Design a binder for this molecule. Sequence first.
Ligand code: 3JW
Length: 279
Amino acid sequence: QFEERHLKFLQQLGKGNFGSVEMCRYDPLTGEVVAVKKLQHSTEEHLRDFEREIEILKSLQHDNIVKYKGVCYLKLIMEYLPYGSLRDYLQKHKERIDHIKLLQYTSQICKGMEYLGTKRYIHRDLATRNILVENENRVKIGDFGLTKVLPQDKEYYKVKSPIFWYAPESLTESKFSVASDVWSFGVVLYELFTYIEKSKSPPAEFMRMIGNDKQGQMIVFHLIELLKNNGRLPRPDGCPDEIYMIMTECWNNNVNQRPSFRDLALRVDQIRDNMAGGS
Ligand SMILES: CCS(=O)(=O)N1CC(CC#N)(n2cc(-c3ncnc4[nH]ccc34)cn2)C1
């Protein structure tokens, strides 16, 4: 474990309404820099969920999943990835990030999700805000606060919300599955190829398609109707048609028709290889 007496707060990395992450120096004896996740508005339910999240991350060992380091007395300690979220990184470096590089990040996210599927985990929160950048060549899935373990007897989990990333059956039945993670991956791919431009973000695009007359519950209603009538996010400027087609396959209303992460990884890798080779 970690001795809090040797943890010095250096910078806030994220301050949510139910959790926060701090950059702290752990110097037990010049020491190391670590990322420290703590609970905000800690209720008995929230601490129970945080305990399970801790256990889920400790069980994960993958190049594209943020590294668990341990716990402190209750705080979650990991590594400090110094380039922050992919949102900040892509915004800052967009002029230098070509499509071959976007597909490198896409492939890495895909392989992390592939690995999560092996353990029958549903992430439920796949979005660029939850992808961290270690260096210019490696990103990692960085947060698992909504992740669920599928029950032994079902291939979905029902849960009582980032609605603009949600599959239709998550919006209607509160059902989450690998296939609804694939839907959200399609939205991540859209985020990447819009270079995280806020006026092109999923919430901005969907509200323009719906109408900004709506508020709260009615937004969800017209989003469901929109998706049921096959309204979809548009092809981002400059986005290759083959990549948009993958997005649209992830966004199939028919759950059975969405691709697997294994197949997504294979195709993304092939497209990137063809792009780099000039074929
Ligand atoms: C849900 C509220 S939050 O503030 O806890 N949340 C985690 C969050 C999203 C992700 N991943 N975040 C993580 C970091 C981060 N940066 C640098 N190294 C790191 N290691 C582990 C996390 C991490 C910064 N913001 C934002």
